[PDB]
Design a protein around this nucleic acid. Structure first.
Ligand SMILES: [Mg+2]
Ligand SMILES: [Mg+2]
Ligand SMILES: [Mg+2]
Ligand SMILES: [Zn+2]
Ligand SMILES: [Zn+2]
Lengths: 145, 1332, 156
DNA sequence: CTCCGACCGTGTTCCCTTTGAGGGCGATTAG
DNA sequence: CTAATCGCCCTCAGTCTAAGAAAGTGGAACACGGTCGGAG
RNA sequence: GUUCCACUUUCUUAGACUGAGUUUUAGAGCUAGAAAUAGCAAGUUAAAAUAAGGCUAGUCCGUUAUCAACUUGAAAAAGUG
């Protein structure tokens, strides 16, 4: 309850709903102070928008609810390692921590392919968490593709 | 590969070596000697310690005193040689008995009574003349022929103590009356000014003028009693003259020239002559009367007796003192007999009580005696007058007192001459030799001549006109006074740095002022309507401006430039001048002075007399003795008139310029043939500056100069305290040995820090207050008497500096309410780290200062200005504070640069193909604030008392921070690295900015910004957090500069390293042989004879000599009645006095001391601080031949050091309360650290200190005080560390319990220890097993 | 007409519009076949969205007009240099080329701080054109920041 | 159209900011 | 007849002359490679 | 940082001086009591020394600075891990 596995399974349920919607099964949940503030799923094809990812939608919903572009002390859970654009958006959002699941050496910019959050040229450092339900996410991705 | 960190202090030089990853290498060094160990691993960190270097002052004082003594002796010898023949007829052995008076009767050659040789005559003498002054007065006033021995005694007594020489000329002391003279002055003044007479008005002039106030105050009071009379007026100026002040008479007589008269100055007669020639000599008698009145009052404090009765007022005043002493002693004895005879024995018999017996026979002072008998007196009745005498300080006064220094030599000369006239009728030789004797007393070697040496005095400079022996009578003829003064001044004046072999010109040299005026004119530009750019002035225009304006008006104002030049010749109604403000800074003052004196402009303008004129100005500068200035100018008296020479004598200049004659007008460019001054006068289109001339690559001046342009001499020639020079030498040597250790590879960077040297006064304070109050006229000293040691309290010192008044509110303060008052910083401490009184102020409430963020507001200034003025005139506030208040109303260091230059010149010695320095080593200089802030920020706390490791730690952190700083921002190299600089940032300050009201705030912001890269998260003052990456890199190159995840761990490992090479510099003790005290006779072998024949058992002498260095002696000494040869090995202390004798022949010295079969090859010189190790690692340092010091350092773990620092400092570390609370909970969680620290201390003491009693008392005292608050306990545990500290054992207080120092009064164990010879770094050791 | 300078000038016009709205003056235009497909300017502060950059707006408009997330062969013109976020979005959009003006070598995502567009592991290579109207772009930025010595240092 | 000639600014961090002591010595203690 | 302890102790005050450096205030430097304006 | 000019405050260096302080000696102590023991009377001054001393023989110098250990080296200086 309220642990990393709980939010990981919630994002997996969101990804299954998005797949039922015939979209990419990628979900993101932004929670601050144990309160869910943003939820999103990757629906780039369903909206004809290359920037319509789960992480981007969650960050936009969080910014709209908080009425502020800064997301200090927020935690973003995601069933997929964030890409370069998602990592840049997390940096600009000034979030507290990002918890991703299955690694992605080809697209994940959170250590697998490169490092973005803790780069020496950045003006902000974000914490990283990995290794939560990677097998289930990989199996779901293989079943979808 | 490696950099060196250095921390240079007055008593310590910390050093460390770090690598690219902030690691300190650990190396295995070979150990030499005959011992077991062959090598030791050592970390490359440590610190050299050494005693402070001392100034040369005391040596100078001693030397001058010596010279004084010898010269006085020579005076006496002159007198005796004059009297010799006539004494031989009267008494064959008088002088012999005189010279042997110190010898005991058993040792005397002649009879014990010096003057006459028998009891009856001696008792008769002492009965008729109880004091010498009786004989003086009788010999001056009487007419009977006197015994030649009494005459000699008088003359010798007057000659041996001649009195001071502070007043020049002669005095007329016949006139002793102040009232009649003042009434006569007022009379003649009212005669000369019939229109307005002064009323005598019953002004008690005697009391006001002779009161113990300052000259100025007495003047103010005098003229306050006079209606309509101003201090600047004629009569006011005359009163000022009689008071010893320097008044100016020019405004009274409409004189354009200054007319300042000082009765003490030897030029008074000539200045008055000139004044009377200007204004008419009918006023001469007027000033004569003023002088006569000054004479009648000069000595009123000492003589106290009308000069009519006698011609010897001094001797008469002494006889008076004697009679009053006698009478009051009889009276006091009678009183104590009548009323308290039980205390009579205590008053007149016990030497130890400070009574009359202690006063006369014991070492009790007049003050201590007075304080002693004050209560006895006041408790009794019938002593109403004795108290009056006591307050006058005139109760039981002696004749030889501390306050007899006021007596001028002119009165002793008067009495001498009187006696000579009296007795020259009976003895012809006194008549024939009167002048000689007078010249013996009068003569005084001029300070500008110096020691009368003959080529064997390092300090002397005087030159001999002939090879005679110098006496007081032939001094003027034998000594070349002129060349001696010339040497006196030329041996001290600076040489031109650009031309080191050339003397600097006089500041008022005509050439120097031509150079300066032209150097200023050369950069003046002008533009007109036609021309397209502003143009320089040409040669013709410059000669025009000089000849027309500079040679006609003494000073040239900007208004005169505009109107008389710009308007008349260029029709410019307005123009802007940029380098001078409202007037030309340069001026031809000497040209107009001379023009006024010689009155012949064409003489000055002739170029051929330039050198002559320069020589005249040189003479005018070189000398100030008018008789010598006149002698120097006597040659040119024929060119214009006697009057011009008379006027030229008075003209005097002081000061010397900066450049030489050859620099300004001597060097000629080979191609041009023109000197610097020629280019300044005319250089065509480019009006090149002197700086440009000196730096123009196209011209050859710079290279022609660059021709002319020892480590110990170089360091000794710097300006500063000898202590820091000592430190400079030590750090240079340390650097050398470090380079040798590192295989002669030079470091990449040398980061140097220097400790605050400004910190490294009761008498000065008492003087300041005394003067300020006397001038102010306040009674607060009489109402509340203070003592110098009371002024050490800051609030009290302030209170007295403000005359018990509020500085902001114009109200009185209370000497009982200082705890309620506040000490406010004038300029807030946040901007200026000034802790002195110059920036601190005592007020009842800081709210009355005005605004909190600034200097006191304009209202406070308006309200308090006049009070501050009064404080300024009373010297109660300085000039700096005043000038800061005023402008506030109208809106690293040189020594470190010298160090950096010495290091850079020693390390970089190679030149590239372009003949430019190859800076292989970068010298970086940092201030202490960087490392201090770094320690505070990252909790690398420092506690000095735990051990000496902090000296090394500071150097390590200096190196680290320096290398990091230069690595991250290489463009700041210009600021932080010596050498190559950047000529910019001056135009940047001509634009508006965010906040540039003060350079201090700019520096603050700057340094608070640059050092942010060390932190991981920043908290701005808005409740805002700022994040930084884990790895810090330099953008342009990408090289990693910092790693927050590992560099801190390395730093902590370095700080925690247990073994650090702390080496105390072994030094041979030098200076005085022993204590100066001369003790009474005593049967003890410690008493050292004061003279060869003065056996200390009979005469006493000196005691407690200082051992220069010990020496190991192995030899044999006789034992028992049969003189068996026993074998001995012991330490014999060679005293400083014995040193030379021991070096000249040690074998003979030791044989004379009682040693036999001395093994010469086993003699070991053991200077102070020699290190000896004993088993279990316990070590001792040689403190003396009979005492040892502690030789160990307690390595306390860093956790306990930080805990102790945080626990001792509670009312500090401001900011967010959360961190303070977390530190409080850390203390309460780790309170067991106290017990662990005391356990550690106990283990250490039991293993090394070996003082069971002191440790048991520590343990007990701590056991009783465990209940007390942790803060107190922590502070007193910090106190506990002096038991374990290095060096001499010392006493300490723990929780009000005082622990006397446990000294090590034996040296036996050292004699079987292992001697450790240590290098300067302590990396190389030679251990000697002293088993032999 | 339709030259690189023409499109950069239009992008500068949009950046000036953003300047009118008191936003960071950055503009972007997405062009396909000499036809206007999308335009945008930075509207982060006024619309409370950290991703409302000129490039994002232009890419979303192009995607909407073309009804396709793939913008094969399109050219995106932007006055300033795009950040890491914008570079990633350009990669995801599969556009053909990006043309930027003045560099910025303290956050640049096209080589200065790092190389992302031409990264070896990407599945599409986006071409980069640099320095179009660099002088006007840098003068606009300096006039907006009102802090000198930055533009000249970057250009030199 | 190359040749002659007077002229001028950009350089520190900065690309939405943080504001008195210590060794000597006599008298006492201790085996 | 040896050594180890405990207290007590320790030269000082002032005047004048000269030169220099070293802090705080103020006023001014320590340059050149193109580069744009005219010419016969 | 270097450097040209003006104002102030501190410090350093060298010179000429003064007044004290300390130590021995001369200031015929008296009256009972052999002695311990006690009473009474004076008490202010003066001479010499003021680092022991040295030769260069001056009306000069003598308390500043410098100095781990060994080796090669009159001094200086260099080498040794
Ligand atoms: Mg002598
Ligand atoms: Mg006496
Ligand atoms: Mg010494
Ligand atoms: Zn993504
Ligand atoms: Zn962007």
């Amino acid at each position: 309850e309220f642990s990393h596995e709980y939010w990981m399974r919630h994002a997996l349920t969101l990804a299954k709903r998005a797949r039922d919607e015939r979209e990419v099964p990628v979900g993101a949940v932004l929670v601050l102070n144990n309160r869910v503030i943003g939820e999103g799923w990757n629906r780039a094809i369903g909206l004809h928008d290359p920037t319509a990812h789960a992480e981007i939608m969650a960050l936009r919903q969080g910014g709209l609810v908080m009425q502020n572009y800064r997301l200090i002390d927020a935690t973003l859970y995601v069933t997929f390692e964030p890409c370069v654009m998602c990592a840049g958006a997390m940096i600009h959002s000034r979030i507290g921590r990002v918890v991703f699941g299955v690694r992605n050496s080809k697209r994940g910019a959170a250590g697998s392919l490169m490092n973005v959050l803790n780069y020496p040229g950045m003006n902000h450092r974000v914490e990283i968490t990995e290794g939560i339900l990677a097998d289930e996410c990989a199996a779901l991705l293989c079943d979808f593709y | 590969k490696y950099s060196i960190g250095l921390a240079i202090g007055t008593n310590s030089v910390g050093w460390a070596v770090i690598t690219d990853e902030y690691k300190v290498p650990s190396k295995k060094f070979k150990v030499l000697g005959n011992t077991d160990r062959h090598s030791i691993k050592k970390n490359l960190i440590g610190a050299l310690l050494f005693d402070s270097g001392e100034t040369a002052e005391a040596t100078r004082l001693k030397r001058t005193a010596r010279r004084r003594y010898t010269r006085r002796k020579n005076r006496i010898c002159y007198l005796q040689e004059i009297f010799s023949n006539e004494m031989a007829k009267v008494d064959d052995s008088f002088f012999h008995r005189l010279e042997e008076s110190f010898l005991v009767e058993e040792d005397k050659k002649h009879e014990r009574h010096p003057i006459f040789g028998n009891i009856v005559d001696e008792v008769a003498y002492h009965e008729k003349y109880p004091t010498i002054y009786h004989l003086r007065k009788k010999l001056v006033d009487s007419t009977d022929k006197a015994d030649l021995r009494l005459i000699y005694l008088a003359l010798a007594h007057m000659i041996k103590f001649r009195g001071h020489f502070l007043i020049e000329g002669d005095l007329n002391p016949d006139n002793s009356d102040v009232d009649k003279l003042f009434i006569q002055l007022v009379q003649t003044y009212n005669q000369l000014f019939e229109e307005n007479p002064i009323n005598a008005s019953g002004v008690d002039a005697k009391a006001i003028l002779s009161a113990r106030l300052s000259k100025s105050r007495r003047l103010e009071n005098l003229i306050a009693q006079l209606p309509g009379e101003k201090k600047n007026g004629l009569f006011g100026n005359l009163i000022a003259l009689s008071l010893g002040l320097t008044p100016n008479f020019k405004s009274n007589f409409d004189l354009a020239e200054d007319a300042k008269l000082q009765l003490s100055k030897d030029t008074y007669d000539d200045d008055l002559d000139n004044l009377l020639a200007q204004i008419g000599d009918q006023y001469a008698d007027l000033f004569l009367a003023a002088k006569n009145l000054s004479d009648a009052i000069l000595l009123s404090d000492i003589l106290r007796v009308n000069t009519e009765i006698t011609k010897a007022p001094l001797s008469a005043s002494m006889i008076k003192r004697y009679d009053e002493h006698h009478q009051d002693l009889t009276l006091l004895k009678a009183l104590v007999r009548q009323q308290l005879p039980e205390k009579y024995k205590e008053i007149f018999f016990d030497q130890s009580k400070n009574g009359y017996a202690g006063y006369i026979d014991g070492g009790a002072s007049q003050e201590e005696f007075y304080k002693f008998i004050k209560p006895i007196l006041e408790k009794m009745d019938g002593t109403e007058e004795l108290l009056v005498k006591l307050n006058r300080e005139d109760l039981l006064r002696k004749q030889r007192t501390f306050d007899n220094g006021s007596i001028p030599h002119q009165i002793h000369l008067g009495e001498l001459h009187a006696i000579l006239r009296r007795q020259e009728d009976f003895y012809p030789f006194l008549k024939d030799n009167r002048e000689k004797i007078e010249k013996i007393l009068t003569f005084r070697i001029p300070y500008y001549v110096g020691p009368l040496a003959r080529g064997n005095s390092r300090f002397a400079w005087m030159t001999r006109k002939s090879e005679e022996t110098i006496t007081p009578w032939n001094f003027e003829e034998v000594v070349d006074k002129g060349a001696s003064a010339q040497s006196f001044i030329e041996r001290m004046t600076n040489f031109d740095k650009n031309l080191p072999n050339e003397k600097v010109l006089p500041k008022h040299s005509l050439l120097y002022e031509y150079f300066t005026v032209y150097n200023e004119l050369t950069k003046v530009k002008y533009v007109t309507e036609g021309m397209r750019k502003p143009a320089f002035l040409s040669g013709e225009q410059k000669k025009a401006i000089v000849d027309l304006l500079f040679k006609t008006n003494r000073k040239v104002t900007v208004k005169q430039l505009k109107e008389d030049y710009f308007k008349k010749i260029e029709c410019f109604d307005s123009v802007e001048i940029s380098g001078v403000e409202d007037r030309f800074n340069a001026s031809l003052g000497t040209y107009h002075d001379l023009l006024k004196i010689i009155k012949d402009k064409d003489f000055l303008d002739n170029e051929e007399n330039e050198d002559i004129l320069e020589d005249i100005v040189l003479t005018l500068t070189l000398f100030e003795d008018r008789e010598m200035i006149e002698e120097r100018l006597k040659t040119y008296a024929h060119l214009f008139d006697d009057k011009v020479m008379k006027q030229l004598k008075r003209r005097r200049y002081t000061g010397w310029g900066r450049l030489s004659r050859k620099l300004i007008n001597g060097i000629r460019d080979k191609q041009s043939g023109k000197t610097i001054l020629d280019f300044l006068k005319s250089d065509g289109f480019a009006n090149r500056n002197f700086m440009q001339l000196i730096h123009d690559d196209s011209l050859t001046f710079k290279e022609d100069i660059q021709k002319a342009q020892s480590l110990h001499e170089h360091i000794a020639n710097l300006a500063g305290s000898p202590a820091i020079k000592k430190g400079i030498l030590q750090t240079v040597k340390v650097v050398d040995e470090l380079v040798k250790v590192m295989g002669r590879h030079k470091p990449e960077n040398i980061v140097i820090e220097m400790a605050r040297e400004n910190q490294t006064n009761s008498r000065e304070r008492m003087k300041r207050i005394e003067e300020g109050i006397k001038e102010l006229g306040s009674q607060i000293l009489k109402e509340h008497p203070v003592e110098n040691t009371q002024l050490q309290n800051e609030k009290l010192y302030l209170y007295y500096l403000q005359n018990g008044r509020d500085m902001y509110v114009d109200q009185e303060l209370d000497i009982n309410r200082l705890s309620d008052y506040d000490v406010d910083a004038i300029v807030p401490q946040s901007f200026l780290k000034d802790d002195s009184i110059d920036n601190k102020v005592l007020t009842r409430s800081d709210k009355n200062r005005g605004k909190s963020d600034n200097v006191p507001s304009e209202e406070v200034v308006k309200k308090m200005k006049n009070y501050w003025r009064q404080l300024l005139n009373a010297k109660l506030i300085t000039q700096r504070k005043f000038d800061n208040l005023t402008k506030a109303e109208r809106g690293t260091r040189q020594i470190t640069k010298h160090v950096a230059q010495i290091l850079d010149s020693r390390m970089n010695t190679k030149y590239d193909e372009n003949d430019k320095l190859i800076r292989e080593v970068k010298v970086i200089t940092l201030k202490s604030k960087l490392v201090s802030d770094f320690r505070k920020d990252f909790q690398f706390y420092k506690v000095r008392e735990i051990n000496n490791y902090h000296h090394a730690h500071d150097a390590y952190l200096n190196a680290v921070v320096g290398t990091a700083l230069i690595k991250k921002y290489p463009k700041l190299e210009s600021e932080f690295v010596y050498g190559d600089y950047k000529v910019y940032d001056v135009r940047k300050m001509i634009a508006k900015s965010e906040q540039e009201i003060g350079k201090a705030t700019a520096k603050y912001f700057f340094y608070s910004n640059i050092m942010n890269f060390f932190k991981t998260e920043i908290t701005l003052a808005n409740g805002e957090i700022r994040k930084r990456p884990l790895i810090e890199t330099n953008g342009e190159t990408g090289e990693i500069v910092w790693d927050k995840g590992r560099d801190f761990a390395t730093v902590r490992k370095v700080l925690s390293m247990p073994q650090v090479n702390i080496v105390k510099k072994t030094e041979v003790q030098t200076g005085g042989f022993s204590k100066e005290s001369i003790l009474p006779k005593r049967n003890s072998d410690k008493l050292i004879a004061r003279k060869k024949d003065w056996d200390p058992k009979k005469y006493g002498g000196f005691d407690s000599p200082t051992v220069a260095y010990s020496v190991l002696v192995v030899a044999k000494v006789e034992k028992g009645k049969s003189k068996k040869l026993k074998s001995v090995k012991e330490l014999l202390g060679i005293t400083i006095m014995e040193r030379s004798s021991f070096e000249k022949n040690p074998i003979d010295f030791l044989e004379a001391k009682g040693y036999k079969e001395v093994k010469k090859d086993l003699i070991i010189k053991l200077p102070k601080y020699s290190l000896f190790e004993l088993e279990n690692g316990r070590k001792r340092m040689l403190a003396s031949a009979g005492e040892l010091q502690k030789g160990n350092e307690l390595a306390l773990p860093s956790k306990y050091v930080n805990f102790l620092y945080l626990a001792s400092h509670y009312e500090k570390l401001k900011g967010s309360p959360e961190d303070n609370e977390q530190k409080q909970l850390f203390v309460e969680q780790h309170k067991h650290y106290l017990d662990e620290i005391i356990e550690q201390i106990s283990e250490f003491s039991k293993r090394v200190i070996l003082a069971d009693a002191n440790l048991d008392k520590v343990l007990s005292a701590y056991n009783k005080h465990r209940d007390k608050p942790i803060r107190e306990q922590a502070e007193n545990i910090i106190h506990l560390f002096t038991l374990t500290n290095l060096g001499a054992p010392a006493a300490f207080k723990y929780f009000d319990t005082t622990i006397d120092r446990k000294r090590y009064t034996s040296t036996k164990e050292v004699l079987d220890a292992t001697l450790i010879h240590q290098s300067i770094t302590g990396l190389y050791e030679t251990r000697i097993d002293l088993s032999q």
